[PDB]
RNA sequence: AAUACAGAGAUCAGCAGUUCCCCUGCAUAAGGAUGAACCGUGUU
């Protein structure tokens, strides 16, 4: 299935975003749009994968994402 | 008129062309017959 559909239904799951600058964002997905802009709650962002700021909500532009690790649960969920 | 002469003086065959008439083609005119499952006012 399409990446976007996959995302739209991962709403409420936990996922890990790598940004183009190296920052890693662990959080629970709360919203997606057609340009893959995200909003996540219960957030922890890291300066790099080596690792630590906790944030309540984060908005991420989709053009800035290298990849998004999904929970293995994904296919059945 | 007398004479000199020279003195009795081609055939077999083919094709097209006019004239009507039939067969078969193509053209030009008019005429008809029948067949063809589909419907134009924010990433390069």
Curated annotation (Swiss-Prot):
Where in or outside the cell it occurs: the entry states: Nucleus; Cytoplasm
Q: Which spans of this chain does the record mark as coiled coil?
A: none
Q: Which domain of life is it from?
A: Eukaryota
Record-annotated Sm domain positions: 2-74
What does the UniProt record say this protein does?
A: Component of LSm protein complexes, which are involved in RNA processing and may function in a chaperone-like manner. Component of the cytoplasmic LSM1-LSM7 complex which is involved in mRNA degradation by activating the decapping step. Together with PAT1, the LSM1-LSM7 complex binds to osmotic stress-activated mRNAs to attenuate the osmotic stress response, probably by limiting ribosome access to the mRNA and consequently translation. Component of the nuclear LSM2-LSM8 complex, which is involved in spliceosome assembly.
Q: What else is known?
A: Present with 3440 molecules/cell in log phase SD medium.
Assembly information from the UniProt record: Component of the heptameric LSM1-LSM7 complex that forms a seven-membered ring structure with a donut shape. The LSm subunits are arranged in the order LSM1, LSM2, LSM3, LSM6, LSM5, LSM7 and LSM4. Except for LSM1, where a C-terminal helix crosses the ring structure to form additional interactions with LSM3 and LSM6, each subunit interacts only with its two neighboring subunits. The LSM1-LSM7 complex interacts with PAT1; within the complex PAT1 has direct interactions with LSM2 and LSM3. The LSM1-LSM7 complex interacts with XRN1.
Family, according to the entry, reads as follows: Belongs to the snRNP Sm proteins family.
- Protein name per Swiss-Prot or TrEMBL: LSM complex subunit LSM4
Task: Report the portion of the entire protein shown.
Answer: 1 to 88 of 187
């Amino acid at each position: 299935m399409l990446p976007l559909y996959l995302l739209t239904n991962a709403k409420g799951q936990q996922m890990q975003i790598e940004l183009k600058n190296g920052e890693i964002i662990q959080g629970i997905l709360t919203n997606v749009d057609n340009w893959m802009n995200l909003t996540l709650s219960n957030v922890t962002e890291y300066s790099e994968e080596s690792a630590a700021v906790k944030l309540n909500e984060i908005y991420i532009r989709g053009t800035f994402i290298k990849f998004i690790k999904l929970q293995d649960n994904i296919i059945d969920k």
